[PDB]
Structure formats: C-alpha cells, structure tokens
C-alpha cells in the first residue's frame, strides 16, 4: 500500500504534466485551424 | 464644415465633404437626429469621402444627408466638475442630473508623453492593503491588472482601492467600464452611491464614471479608454496628481477594436483579430504610463478567452502589464475576503533593487512559507507523517496565522458590517510580516489575525480574545 | 465597374432627362441576386428602412453605397423580377404591439399565421428601438421561478435579467423553456398583477411542425393567456428570420413600459446569428470570425440588452430574456456562446452526459451560474437553496473517488452519500412544473437530511409520494411557506414532524 | 505646383498614402509630406505612389502636398550618434540638443558578399558566467536570446551592454565597443529606465538606443532595426567593432504583419506574410567580421524573440533560428526555481562561439561543460534515487554545484579573468565540501578576495590569455587557501 500510494502519486503527476502540454498544443492547434478558416474566407471574399 | 451622408453601414457611414475636410481620426455632428449623432472620420477616398465610424443607432440616415465638421478629435468635458458623474464617450451626461457644467474640455484621441517627459523613478505605489503591497505591490504608471469574476470581490477591492488611493495620496479616480452591461453598471452606481464613493448630494465624491455599454456600436466602445483615460489625464497634466484609470475589462477593448477593423473592410489578423492590435494597445496602454508631474495608474480587470495565455488580445495584455493580482473564491471559501491569491500573482515591481532589500526578504519569506505550506497541507491532508515535524507544525502555524493576516477589514464593507475598515502603510505590513516570520508571535492563536488592520491590533484582539 | 453603371439607367440617362420615375420615392429594381435585391433610386430612403415591392412583397433596405440600396427581401425571390417598381413606405419597420396578442402565433412582421383570424391591435411599436440605460433601469427585484427544481435552487432566474440556456442539440433547453411557461399557469389565474406574466417564445429557423407541436403543448396545458409565439421557421425568408427576435422584443417591452412583467425565450438565437450572417455576406459585408461580420456582438447584445427591471417611476415593468444557444460538441468557446455568454447576467448550462446518464432535466452545472443567483429567490428557497448548494458543491469534488467511495473512509462516505440523494432529488419529469411552496418542501427535506438511510432507487418514489402527501393533507403548511416567503422556526418545527412521522410511515 | 517632383494624397487610409503624380520618384525612396512627416515611396504605379508614412495620418490629409527628399532612405549616422536616444529616422528624442551627424548611411542595402567576410574570430563576453563559459560570443556573429516572456532576455543585453564599459575605458581600439539598443515595441517606460540603468552605470559612451516604442507608429517600428544596422554597419565598415541587440524583435515581424495586411498581402502562416523570412534575413545578415582587406571590424546582432508560453518551433523562432547563427536558449520553469539567468544550457546553443573562446576558458570551461553534461541525465535518477553509485550522486552532487555557481545578480557582469578565477575554483571540485545554500555566499567572498588580494595574477590571466602552468599552481594555492579559511 506504501508503495502503491507512491506509484499513484507519481503517474498522477506525470498524468498532470501531459495534460498541461496537451492543452497548450490543443490551444495553438486551435487558433491554427481559426486562422486557417478565417484566411479561407478571407481569400474567397477578395478573389470574389 | 458642411458635408453630406452618402451610404451607410452602421457604425460604418462615409461622408461625402466638397469643402475644407478634417483629417484623420476626428468627430462630426450628424444633424436631423433627435440626438447628436458623432462620427469619427478616416479615409479620404475621393470627392473627400471619409469612412467615419458612427457612434449610435444610424436607424434614419438618408442619402445626402448634411453634417457639421466640428474640427477637434473628440472633445469631451473633462474637470473636477466630472466626479460623480456618469458620461459617454461623446462626453454626454447620461446620469441624468444635468449638464457636467465644468470649463476646460479636452480632445480624446491625444499622443502619448514624450521621452522626456518620463519618470525614470519606479516609485512603488502603496495602496494600503496588505496582501497588495506586500506581495504584487502597485506602481505609479503601472499597466497592472486584476483577474477577477463574479462571486470574488471585485468591486468590493475596486471602491477599497478608490478610497485608499483618495485618502492615502490625493488622486481621484476614473472607472471606464468598456462593453459594461447595464444591469452590472447599475449596480456599481448604485453600489459606489451607497458605499461613498460617489455623492450625490456635494462636492466630494472621488471616481468619475464612463461607462461604454454593450448596445452601443463597437465604434462607441473602443473610444471608452480613450474617454476615461482622457479625464485621468486631465488629472494627471493639470494637477500632477496620482490617478487611477480602472478599465473594466480589457478583453471588450480589444474586441470592440476587432469589430471596427472588421467593419472598415481591413483583412483581419491571426485568431480573429484585427491588424492594428499591439498599434491600438500602444496608443492607450502608452498613455497610461507616468510622467514627470502625475501618475496615472491603470487597475484593469481583463477576460482571457478559452482560458488561453496564448490568445494574442492577452498577448499583448501581460505585453503591457506589470502586477496581475489574482482573485478567487478558493481563499475566500477559506474565509478571507476577497481570494487575492498571491501565490499566481506575479509583479514585475518585485525585486529587492527597486522596493528595498526588507521589502523584498520578507515577500519571500511569505511567499515560500505559503508554498511550503501548500505542499505539508496537501501530506497532512493525506496523513503520511501526521504531524510530519515539530518544524511542520511550526511552518503550519505560522502560515496559518499569515493566511489570517492577510485579511483587512474594507472601509468599503464598514456600513453594513461592524468590523471596522482600516488603512495600513507599508512600513507596518514590513513589520507585522516580519514580527509574524521571526517567530516573535508565536504564544497567538490563529484567529487573532483574521480581520485586523496592523500588527498591533492584532495583539491587542489577541488579548480581548483572552477571556 | 460600378454597380448601377449599367447601359440601362445609363441609357435612360442620356436620351433624355427623365424626371419621370421621381427616383426618391420609388425606384427600380436593378440585380436581384439570391435574397437581396440592390435597387436604383430611393435617393430619399432612409435605413433600416422597409420598402415594398411591386408584385405585393416588403422588404427592409440596408446599404445605400453611395449609388445603392441594398433591399433585402421580406420573401420567396422568385418572383421579384429585374426593373420592377420599389416604393417606400416611410417608416422604420414597426411591430403591432398590444394586450390583444395573446393567445395567438404570429409571424415576425407582426401577422397571424395559425389562421384564428387576424390581430385586434392598438398601437405598433418601432423595432429596434434603443435599450433603456442606467437610471431607468434598476436590477432584479423579483425572483423568476422557473419550476425546475435545479434551476430555481442553483441557479435561479430574476424578473428582470437575462438568462442564456446553452447546452447540445437535444439536451433540453426547449423543455425548460416550456416548463418556464407551464409553471406561470399558477401565478396568472388569479390576483396580483406583480405576480401574473406574459411569455413570449421567439421560435427562430425551427421547423413549423414542431412549432405546432410546441403550441399544441401550450393548449392543452392552457398556456394561452401570458404567451404569444413568435415563428420565423426555416422555411421562411433569411431577413423574416433575423428580425423576429426584436419583434417578439418589442412586444415585450409594450408589456414591461407598461407596468406589468414579461419574459421571452429566444429559441435558436444561434440561428438568428446563421440568417444575419447569410443576408450579410450576400451583402458583400466584409466578414469576420468563422464569417460572422463585425456587428454580430452589437446585434446580440442590442437584442438582449432590452431586459432590465424598471424602477418604481417608470412603472414595475420588468423582462426577462432567455436565449437559448446550440453548441456543437461542447465547443463553448465558438463565436457566438462566447458572444452571448459575455452578454447575458447568467448561464444555464446543459452537459449532455448527465441526460444520458439519466438525470433529467439535464441541467449539468458547475459550468452553469448565475451572476446574480442568490438575491433572486424566496428566503424559504435562499436559505435551503444555499445549504444545497454548499452541499452538492463538496459533493462534486468527490464524485471520481465515489467510484471507488466504498474502500475509503466514513465522513466522505456521508458526503458522496448526501450528495447522491440531493443529486437525484433534482431530477424531475418532463412537462410537470413544480411550485415553489413543493420544491421548497423537498430540498428541505433532503438538506435536512432524512433521505440519507433510503436507496438511491427509492428517492424519487419518495418525492412523488411526498408532493402527494403534502398537497393532500398539509394546504396550510404550503399556504404559510408561499406567504410569508420563508420558513419561520413553526414551519421549521412543523416539517421536522411531518417529515418524521412520513419517513416513520413510507414503505 | 509640378507633378514631376511633387505630388497630391489622393487617399491616405489605414497604413498607405495613394499619392498622385510625382513622377521623378524612384522606388523606396524617403519623400516627405508638409505636415512635416516622412514616408518612404513604396509600390510605384501608373497613376499613384503607394508611400508609407513614418507616424501617425492624423497629421496627414487629403491633397497635402507631397515633396521629393531626393535621395532612398537614409539614417544619420556616425560616432556623433554616441551616447543618446534616437528616434528610427534619427531623430534624437533624449531633449538635450541635435544630432552632429556628417555622414549618412542607407537603411536598406545589401549583407556582404562572402569574400569580404571573414569567419567569427574576436571573443566578445558579456561578462554572464553561464553565457561567456558555455553558449559564448564572437565579434563577428549572429546570437538570437530566445524566451518567454519576463524571463531574462533584457537583462542578458544589459549586462553585455554594461560589460563592455571595462574595454572601452582603456587603451586598445580594437577592444573598445559601440553599441546599439533598437527597442521595437517596447513600452516607453521601459526604454526609460533602460537609459537610467545605463546612465546610472555610466555605460553609455558605446550606446545609441534607437527607440520606435509602441505608442510609435508601425512602419516606424518597421524601419528601426535596419536604422540601427545602418548604425552599426557604419562602425563594422570603418572598421570599429560593434554590437547590437534588437529588443522583441517580434514585435518588429508584428508591425510587419500589421503593415503588410493592410497592404491587402495575402497572409501565410498564423497571419504572417511570405516576407517575414527576407525580412529578418536582409536585418541580421549584416554581421559579420570583416577580412582586414576591408578595413577590419565585425558587427555582433543579437536579436531578442519572444515566444507564447516555450515554443520555441512557433512561425517566427524558427525563422530567426534559421537566420542567426546561435540560439542562446532561455526558459521560464527555471526562472521561477531561482536561478538567474534561465539558461537551458543542454538546449540553448551558441553555435559558432567556441572558436571565439578566452584559451583560458577553453582551458577551465570544457570540463565544465562535460561535468554538466553528465548532469543532464542523472536529475530523473535523482528524483528516483534512494540507492545510488557513490560516483553517480558526486558527478550529479557536482553538477547541482556548477548550476548553483552559475548563478548571477543583475547589472554585475564579470570580468573574464574573474570567470576563469570563480569556474576554476568550481570545476574539479573545491565546492565539493560546500552546500548549495552556500556556493553563492562563497562565491561572492572569494570573489572579493580574489580582486582585492590577488590582482596580479588576474593580471596574468587577462595579459597572456591562457592559464600558464605557475599561475595554475598560484591559483589552486589560493582556492585551496581561501577554502581553509572560509568558515560558512
Ligand atoms: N424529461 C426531460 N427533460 C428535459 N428534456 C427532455 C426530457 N425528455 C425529452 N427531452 C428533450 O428535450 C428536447 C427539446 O428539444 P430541443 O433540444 O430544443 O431540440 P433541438 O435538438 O432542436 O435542440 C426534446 O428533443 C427531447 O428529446
Ligand atoms: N537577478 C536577475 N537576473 C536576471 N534577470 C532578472 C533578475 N531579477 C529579475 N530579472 C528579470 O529581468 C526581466 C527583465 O525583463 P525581460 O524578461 O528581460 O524582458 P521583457 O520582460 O521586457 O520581455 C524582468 O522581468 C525580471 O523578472
Ligand atoms: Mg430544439
Ligand atoms: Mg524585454
């Protein structure tokens, strides 16, 4: 149970870190996929 | 000078002037209207055409339509004639308690200070509040910012920094609520009218209101830190005095400066946003800096969208910013009142070259006790050592007694509340933290620190507890 | 290049000077394009400003660009036709406004459509009219019941705010809507006119089938005397979709200018937004995020900003907007949940994990609050609502470590135990409003915390039979919570009687 | 008046001014409008001239009447420019009198060729243990500081600048510097306090600032770090050893960004043009050192970028890591752990710095950088170690003791012979009896011995610049010494 609770403290951390990361390159995905969309309109409603 | 309305889109309606033409960036009077409708003129196009930004509801405008050329930017009435009082950012009363019946106007859509009208002294602005100026101090010409919400208390902390900055230095203050929402603007008149902030019945009222609303055009809503930061500077270069700019939100500028880029027809930026962004925030958040005689100081509560750092409106946010004071509802579920949290509240201003080598030893002090406390809270919640150390138990009093501390009462919270507000200096936050980390407190109980102004008092409550 | 430079006008230009089509009153009909007609002439129109159409149309002119006027057409453009003959009307679009609405769906131009004969009103009202300000407004007095227990307990609504419903396709969000109208049945069959109401549900690009069976709902559940139903369907015209929130508005604030209370639901606001943004881009607006243009926020905001309690000179007139967003995935962080979230004074927030997960109504707060929520309720409902909300509020931290709750200690065990029973004391059957007085009566008795022996199955029996019990036998006890407003210490002692002699006698 | 030299604004709207006629222009030529204002003659075409202007077009209306300078845009230049605050145009803003420039020297030509260049060959320290020991400079070179924000980047430019105030105090021309700080954005206030520390130090004598904060204008932002090229490139070409530092030089690619969208360019990546590359490319490339046929002398860039929470892979850091020949890496979870400056010393390059070395800190610095680089495996079994190697938790104990050595103050930069002094007592293990909690107390008190005491042989190491056989003896005498009589 010593051990366990320590394993579980661990992964819980190296769990945490990887959300953190996760969330940062979902967020610059996310403002990539807006600026793609948004310069697609963009160029269709000047080339119109 | 007299044009004509030739086409209309909203807050996008270009004049047609055949005459003598204003430049960029300045107001006309559309005539015919029940009210004024102001129009800020740029772009010249030919037959002096001019794309101005229109203000209001352009339900009513028709083709051919005659307008004044008033020449100057914006001109609002600007005044200690203004505290109390509520206006729009054509300068219009809309508090409905008469005319501002002040005497010197002045131009919103100005330039920032010169090199050499700077000041190259970081003076460290003392609010009065401990947990302020102990661990995210202010400072004059600070960008700084709040980050707030609902059931924190943020106005609570805003009218508490009105009357300490009021009383403790002789500044006034201006509060620019920008995209504010009526019923929440409503309740901040109403809210400042029975704390004392504003009164209504003589002349000493201390916060003069611009509230931008939501349902005016975003040209109308991008002008609204221009408003307040243009009475703020006439506080600043005609009394040389220490002011506080309190923009309710930052976010709303800058998507109010988003929706006028986009309706002017530019090709917007990354994320939604509009080119001219770190242009726009220079302009104003370059105004708000401190010169040589005042002080302007901006307190602003900010809104990060999709609880992104990376956003470019924050980007150019904590660009400009310098003290980023948290508040929260975790330390106010702990009972302190409002959850300041410290611990997430990074100030630049905090470094031992430039608040002194006490200041900054026991902002450390306080700060690793807290965080070592947050660390042994988390094992003793989880009971591995139980009371890990007599060490343990000592740092676990010690921060909980400094947690106690960093309450104040608010002279704000003192009308309805009993516990009376008191304003402490910062040598006495220097000395009570410091009498508090020495273990020279020790023999006190915890709950003689919650709700005390200084460090004496705090004795003093401790031996009235003794009963 | 230009737009009217065309060699008809041109043509007619130069034989000779007309002087004959007046070209400021009427005007001709130049490229009609998809829903948007850019009409030559009007030298003398104003915006915002409806037109008709010589084959017996209407049609609201925008943009004048400095040669034309941009008249987006008020129906099917098949048969609107290139040359035909425009004539103003004179006038911003005007709503037709009244007491004689009631009872009767209508359509966004202020006309009847379910065909019981026409409308008997008095006095049209200019749409979009300007949002009263600071002063004549003041901030919610009255609490705003809306039947559900979850919603008037966490996150109450006031007369006099904004409350945006946002959640997933089906996941309620129209049932609370209804329920929100259901529940006003009690308040408007009898006496004080600061109690009774009007609603009015703005259906926006729905289907018209389901605009029948919504109005089928509200006969037969005899919801006729507060409402009117506003449609503006999917089959009808881009503009007639855009302008039906600020026609069932302006009905609304009739009612609030008034003296007497109101509330409206703006069913698929998102779809208000998806008409702006067609009749725009086919303006050649320049857009902006996701091709929303510029003034989407103004537009939302200038629509939902008209809600505000008003103070005791300007009558007691108060609104109450329910807006209700659609998103996709749960994606809150799209234009328009983010626009109108920033806008309006609370949100009521659906996870549709919880629907599935089957408890319903499928409010799944943590995410849902509301701004103003403790200050927009009773004193019976704010002193259990409070406690309930401390309570489910330690309960929600704890739930992952319920799933394994069974191998951990005993004062958690209690928590995630009282918080199961409170949790499953919110849900509540679709269509069946509860009073205040009840609810009230049942949140007491799960804070109070004589459920906590009972299994998780058996809680909802319990609550059925408990608002049986209570109607039947105790009338005065619910008689002395809906007039004094509170519990005062003897319906306290009162309900520690009967809720122990009732769980004493249960199964 | 005549369309030929002059011209009318037919429509200044968001950035450009559409001028009409003035048909003797040439491309990209400063042209300035009687408002008093410049611009600089952008796209030539048949019936206009597209001039951007360099402030604001609130001055500016329509039909102000627009008059050739004669000549493509320009910057006043010279060792005149000593000492003061410019404007980007050469303007001096610091209020204490005009400029006495007598040349002029162009914003915008062409990098070197690859003869009259020469390879990275002076050291040029800026006096941080970490940098001038590990990720060092040469005169001659390209160092991008990249990191977050309010890491260390300024700082780092600062002590280099203040550095360089030991050298150019003394005798030899070809170690003095002069030195230019282009502020691209940056808040005025800053830049403000940025002259006082220099002032206060009195570190100026090398230092221009050209200023283009961000209350200026965007194409002034645009123009600022090619003036101070030209600044600098002024010195290189006479051959006088220069340096440079391009504070937020993001902001710079922004203003462009900014600029070439209202331009309607069509916008590539995260809304960043296809020029952003040529942009920063014909910026940095114009350092180099120069072969001593072409006089003598090297230009030393280094741009300061900025990035959104370490992404060091954005749009613009790999760009301006493709441009410049090092990466002096930065990061931010180290800033918060103490230590200062936030040198990811594993990841953070200087690429072609160790040529430009000391020879004594060849001598006392490559063992230190293997001693650290068997550090960078063992932290994770540090983490995890209860039972370890006696030999594996000394080489990790003595990497925890050189990352602890290499801590620094602001605004105290070391002399190099003091870094070979302090690194020579920490590499091959005096510290080994030391706590971490002490290194830097002990640090500072040999420190001060060592300069008072003991400064012939500090003269010895900076006079022949290695470390000779009996001064290696002296020096082990005295950390030996200092390490016996230094109690706690
Ligand atoms: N007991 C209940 N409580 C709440 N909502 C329910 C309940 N039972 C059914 N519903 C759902 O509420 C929905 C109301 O429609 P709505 O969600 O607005 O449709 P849409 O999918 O177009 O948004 C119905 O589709 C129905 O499936
Ligand atoms: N002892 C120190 N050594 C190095 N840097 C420090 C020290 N103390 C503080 N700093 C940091 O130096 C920074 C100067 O700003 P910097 O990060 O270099 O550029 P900017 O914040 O303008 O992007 C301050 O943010 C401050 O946090
Ligand atoms: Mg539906
Ligand atoms: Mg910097």
Redesign the interface.
Same mark, same amino acid.
């Given at each position: 149970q010593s051990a366990r609770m320590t394993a579980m403290d661990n992964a819980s951390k190296n769990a945490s870190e990887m959300i953190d990361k996760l969330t /940062?390159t979902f967020?610059?995905t996310?403002?990539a996929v807006?600026?793609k969309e /948004?310069i697609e309109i963009?160029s269709g409603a000047?080339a119109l | 000078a007299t044009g004509r309305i030739?086409?209309?889109?909203?807050?996008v309606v270009?004049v047609?002037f055949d005459e003598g033409?204003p430049?960029?960036?300045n107001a006309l009077e559309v005539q015919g209207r029940e009210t004024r409708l102001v129009l800020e003129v740029?772009?010249?196009?030919?037959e002096?055409t001019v794309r101005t930004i229109a203000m209001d509801?352009?339900?009513?405008?028709?083709?051919?339509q005659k307008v004044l050329d008033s020449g100057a930017?914006i001109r609002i009435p600007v005044g200690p004639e203004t505290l109390g009082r509520?206006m729009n950012v054509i300068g219009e009363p809309?508090?409905?308690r008469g005319p501002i019946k002040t005497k010197q106007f002045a131009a919103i859509?100005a330039?920032?200070?010169?090199?050499?009208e700077?000041?190259?002294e970081?003076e460290i602005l003392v609010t009065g509040i401990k947990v302020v100026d102990l661990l995210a101090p202010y400072a004059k010409?600070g960008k700084i910012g709040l980050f707030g919400g609902?059931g924190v208390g943020k106005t609570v902390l805003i009218m508490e920094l009105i009357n300490n900055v009021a009383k403790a230095h002789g500044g006034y203050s201006v509060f620019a609520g920008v995209?504010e929402?009526?019923?929440?603007?409503?309740?901040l008149?109403?809210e400042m009218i029975e704390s004392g902030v504003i009164n209504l019945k003589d002349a000493t009222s201390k916060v003069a209101l611009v509230?931008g609303?939501?349902?005016?055009?975003?040209g109308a809503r991008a002008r609204v830190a221009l408003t307040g930061l243009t009475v703020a500077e006439y506080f600043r270069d005609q009394e040389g005095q220490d002011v506080l700019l309190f923009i309710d939100n930052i976010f709303?500028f800058t998507?109010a400066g988003?929706?006028?880029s986009?309706?002017?027809?530019?090709?917007?930026?990354?994320?939604?946003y509009q080119?001219?962004?770190?242009?726009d925030?220079?302009?104003m958040?370059?105004?708000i800096?401190?010169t040589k005689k005042g002080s302007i100081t901006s307190v602003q509560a900010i809104?990060v969208?999709?609880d992104?750092?990376?956003?470019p409106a924050p980007?150019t946010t904590?660009?400009?910013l310098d003290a980023t004071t948290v508040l929260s509802r975790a330390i106010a579920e702990l009972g302190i009142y409002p959850a300041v949290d410290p611990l997430d509240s990074?100030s630049?201003i905090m470094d031992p070259?430039i608040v002194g080598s006490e200041h900054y030893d026991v902002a450390r002090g306080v700060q690793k006790i807290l965080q070592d406390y947050k660390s042994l809270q988390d094992i003793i919640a989880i009971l591995g050592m139980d009371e890990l150390s007599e060490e343990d138990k000592l740092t676990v009093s010690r921060a909980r007694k400094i947690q106690r501390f960093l309450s104040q009462p608010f002279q704000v919270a003192e009308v309805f509340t009993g516990h009376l507000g008191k304003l402490v200096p910062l040598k006495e936050t220097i000395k009570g933290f410091q009498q508090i980390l020495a273990g020279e407190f020790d023999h006190l109980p915890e709950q003689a620190f919650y709700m005390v102004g200084p460090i004496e008092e705090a004795v003093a409550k401790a031996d009235k507890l003794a009963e | 290049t230009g737009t009217a430079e065309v060699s008809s006008i041109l043509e007619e230009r130069i034989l000779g000077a007309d002087t004959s089509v007046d070209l400021e009153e009427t005007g001709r009909v130049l490229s009609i394009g998809d829903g948007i007609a850019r009409v030559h002439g009007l030298?003398?129109?104003?915006?915002?400003?409806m037109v008709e159409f010589s084959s017996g149309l209407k049609g609201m002119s925008?943009?004048?660009?400095?040669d034309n006027v941009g008249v987006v057409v008020f129906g099917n453009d098949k048969l609107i036709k290139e040359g035909d003959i425009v004539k103003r009307t004179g006038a911003?679009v005007d709503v037709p406004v009244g007491e004689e609405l009631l009872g009767r769906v209508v359509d966004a131009l202020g006309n009847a459509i379910d065909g019981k004969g026409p409308i008997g009103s008095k006095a049209r009202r200019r749409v979009?009219l300007?949002?009263?300000?600071?002063?004549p407004?003041?901030?919610?007095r009255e609490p705003m019941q809306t039947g559900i227990k979850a919603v008037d307990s966490l996150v109450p609504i006031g007369r006099?705010?904004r409350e945006l419903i946002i959640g997933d396709r089906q996941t309620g969000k129209t049932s609370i809507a209804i329920d929100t109208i259901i529940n006003q049945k009690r308040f408007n069959d009898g006496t004080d006119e600061k109690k009774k109401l009007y609603c009015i549900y703005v259906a926006i690009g729905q289907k018209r089938s389901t605009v029948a069976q919504l109005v089928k709902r509200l006969t037969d559940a005899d919801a006729m005397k507060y409402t009117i139903v506003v449609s503006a369907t999917a089959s009808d015209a881009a503009p007639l979709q855009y302008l039906a929130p600020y026609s069932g508005c302006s009905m609304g604030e009739y009612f609030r200018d008034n003296g007497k209370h109101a509330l409206i639901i703006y069913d698929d606001l998102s779809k208000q937004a998806v008409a702006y943004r067609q009749m725009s881009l086919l303006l050649r607006?320049?857009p902006?995020?996701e091709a929303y243009?510029?003034?989407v926020?103004?537009l939302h905001?200038?629509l939902l900003?008209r809600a505000?309690k008003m103070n005791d000179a300007f009558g007691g007139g108060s609104l109450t907007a329910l807006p209700v967003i659609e998103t996709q995935a749960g994606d809150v962080?799209a234009?328009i949940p983010?626009n109108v979230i920033?806008?309006t004074?609370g949100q009521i927030f659906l996870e549709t994990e919880l629907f599935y997960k089957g408890i319903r109504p499928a409010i799944n707060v943590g995410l849902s609050?509301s701004?103003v929520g403790s200050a927009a309720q009773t004193r019976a409902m704010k002193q259990v609502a409070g406690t309930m909300k401390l309570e489910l509020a330690q309960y929600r931290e704890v739930a992952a470590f319920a799933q394994f709750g069974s191998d951990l200690d005993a004062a958690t065990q209690q928590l995630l135990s009282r918080g199961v029973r409170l949790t499953e004391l919110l849900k509540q059957g679709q269509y069946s409003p509860m009073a205040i007085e009840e609810q009230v009566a049942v949140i007491y008795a799960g804070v109070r915390g004589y459920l906590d022996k009972l299994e998780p199955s058996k809680i909802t029996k319990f609550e059925n039979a408990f608002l049986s019990h209570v109607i039947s036998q105790h009338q005065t006890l619910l008689g002395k919570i809906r007039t004094d407003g509170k519990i005062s210490e003897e319906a306290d002692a009162k309900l520690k009687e009967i809720v122990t002699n009732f769980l004493a006698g249960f199964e």
């Amino acid at each position: 149970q010593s051990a366990r609770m320590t394993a579980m403290d661990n992964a819980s951390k190296n769990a945490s870190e990887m959300i953190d990361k996760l969330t /940062l390159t979902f967020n610059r995905t996310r403002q990539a996929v807006i600026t793609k969309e /948004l310069i697609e309109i963009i160029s269709g409603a000047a080339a119109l | 000078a007299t044009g004509r309305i030739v086409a209309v889109i909203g807050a996008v309606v270009d004049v047609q002037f055949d005459e003598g033409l204003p430049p960029i960036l300045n107001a006309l009077e559309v005539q015919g209207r029940e009210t004024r409708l102001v129009l800020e003129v740029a772009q010249h196009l030919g037959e002096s055409t001019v794309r101005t930004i229109a203000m209001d509801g352009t339900e009513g405008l028709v083709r051919g339509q005659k307008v004044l050329d008033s020449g100057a930017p914006i001109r609002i009435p600007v005044g200690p004639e203004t505290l109390g009082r509520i206006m729009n950012v054509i300068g219009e009363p809309i508090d409905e308690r008469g005319p501002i019946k002040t005497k010197q106007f002045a131009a919103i859509h100005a330039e920032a200070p010169e090199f050499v009208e700077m000041s190259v002294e970081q003076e460290i602005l003392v609010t009065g509040i401990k947990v302020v100026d102990l661990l995210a101090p202010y400072a004059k010409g600070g960008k700084i910012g709040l980050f707030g919400g609902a059931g924190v208390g943020k106005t609570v902390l805003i009218m508490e920094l009105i009357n300490n900055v009021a009383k403790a230095h002789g500044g006034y203050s201006v509060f620019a609520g920008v995209g504010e929402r009526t019923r929440e603007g409503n309740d901040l008149y109403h809210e400042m009218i029975e704390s004392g902030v504003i009164n209504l019945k003589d002349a000493t009222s201390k916060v003069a209101l611009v509230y931008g609303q939501m349902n005016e055009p975003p040209g109308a809503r991008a002008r609204v830190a221009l408003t307040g930061l243009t009475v703020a500077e006439y506080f600043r270069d005609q009394e040389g005095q220490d002011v506080l700019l309190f923009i309710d939100n930052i976010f709303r500028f800058t998507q109010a400066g988003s929706e006028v880029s986009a309706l002017l027809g530019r090709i917007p930026s990354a994320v939604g946003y509009q080119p001219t962004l770190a242009t726009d925030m220079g302009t104003m958040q370059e105004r708000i800096t401190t010169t040589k005689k005042g002080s302007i100081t901006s307190v602003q509560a900010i809104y990060v969208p999709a609880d992104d750092l990376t956003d470019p409106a924050p980007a150019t946010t904590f660009a400009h910013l310098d003290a980023t004071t948290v508040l929260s509802r975790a330390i106010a579920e702990l009972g302190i009142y409002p959850a300041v949290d410290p611990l997430d509240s990074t100030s630049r201003i905090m470094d031992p070259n430039i608040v002194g080598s006490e200041h900054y030893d026991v902002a450390r002090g306080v700060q690793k006790i807290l965080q070592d406390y947050k660390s042994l809270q988390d094992i003793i919640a989880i009971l591995g050592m139980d009371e890990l150390s007599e060490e343990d138990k000592l740092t676990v009093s010690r921060a909980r007694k400094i947690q106690r501390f960093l309450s104040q009462p608010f002279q704000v919270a003192e009308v309805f509340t009993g516990h009376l507000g008191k304003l402490v200096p910062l040598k006495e936050t220097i000395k009570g933290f410091q009498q508090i980390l020495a273990g020279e407190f020790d023999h006190l109980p915890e709950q003689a620190f919650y709700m005390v102004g200084p460090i004496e008092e705090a004795v003093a409550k401790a031996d009235k507890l003794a009963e | 290049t230009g737009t009217a430079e065309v060699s008809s006008i041109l043509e007619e230009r130069i034989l000779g000077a007309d002087t004959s089509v007046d070209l400021e009153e009427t005007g001709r009909v130049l490229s009609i394009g998809d829903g948007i007609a850019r009409v030559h002439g009007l030298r003398n129109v104003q915006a915002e400003e409806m037109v008709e159409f010589s084959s017996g149309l209407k049609g609201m002119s925008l943009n004048l660009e400095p040669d034309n006027v941009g008249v987006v057409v008020f129906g099917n453009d098949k048969l609107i036709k290139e040359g035909d003959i425009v004539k103003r009307t004179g006038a911003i679009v005007d709503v037709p406004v009244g007491e004689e609405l009631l009872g009767r769906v209508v359509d966004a131009l202020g006309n009847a459509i379910d065909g019981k004969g026409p409308i008997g009103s008095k006095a049209r009202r200019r749409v979009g009219l300007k949002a009263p300000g600071i002063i004549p407004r003041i901030s919610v007095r009255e609490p705003m019941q809306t039947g559900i227990k979850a919603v008037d307990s966490l996150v109450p609504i006031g007369r006099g705010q904004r409350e945006l419903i946002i959640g997933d396709r089906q996941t309620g969000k129209t049932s609370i809507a209804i329920d929100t109208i259901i529940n006003q049945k009690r308040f408007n069959d009898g006496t004080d006119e600061k109690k009774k109401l009007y609603c009015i549900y703005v259906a926006i690009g729905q289907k018209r089938s389901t605009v029948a069976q919504l109005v089928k709902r509200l006969t037969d559940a005899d919801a006729m005397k507060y409402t009117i139903v506003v449609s503006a369907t999917a089959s009808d015209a881009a503009p007639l979709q855009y302008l039906a929130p600020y026609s069932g508005c302006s009905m609304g604030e009739y009612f609030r200018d008034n003296g007497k209370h109101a509330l409206i639901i703006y069913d698929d606001l998102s779809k208000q937004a998806v008409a702006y943004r067609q009749m725009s881009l086919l303006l050649r607006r320049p857009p902006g995020r996701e091709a929303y243009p510029g003034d989407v926020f103004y537009l939302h905001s200038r629509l939902l900003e008209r809600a505000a309690k008003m103070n005791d000179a300007f009558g007691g007139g108060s609104l109450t907007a329910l807006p209700v967003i659609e998103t996709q995935a749960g994606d809150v962080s799209a234009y328009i949940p983010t626009n109108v979230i920033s806008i309006t004074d609370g949100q009521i927030f659906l996870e549709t994990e919880l629907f599935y997960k089957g408890i319903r109504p499928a409010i799944n707060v943590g995410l849902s609050v509301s701004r103003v929520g403790s200050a927009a309720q009773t004193r019976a409902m704010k002193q259990v609502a409070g406690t309930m909300k401390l309570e489910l509020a330690q309960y929600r931290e704890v739930a992952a470590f319920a799933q394994f709750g069974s191998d951990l200690d005993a004062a958690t065990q209690q928590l995630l135990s009282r918080g199961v029973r409170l949790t499953e004391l919110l849900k509540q059957g679709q269509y069946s409003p509860m009073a205040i007085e009840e609810q009230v009566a049942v949140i007491y008795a799960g804070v109070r915390g004589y459920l906590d022996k009972l299994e998780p199955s058996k809680i909802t029996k319990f609550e059925n039979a408990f608002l049986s019990h209570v109607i039947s036998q105790h009338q005065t006890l619910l008689g002395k919570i809906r007039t004094d407003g509170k519990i005062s210490e003897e319906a306290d002692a009162k309900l520690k009687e009967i809720v122990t002699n009732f769980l004493a006698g249960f199964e």
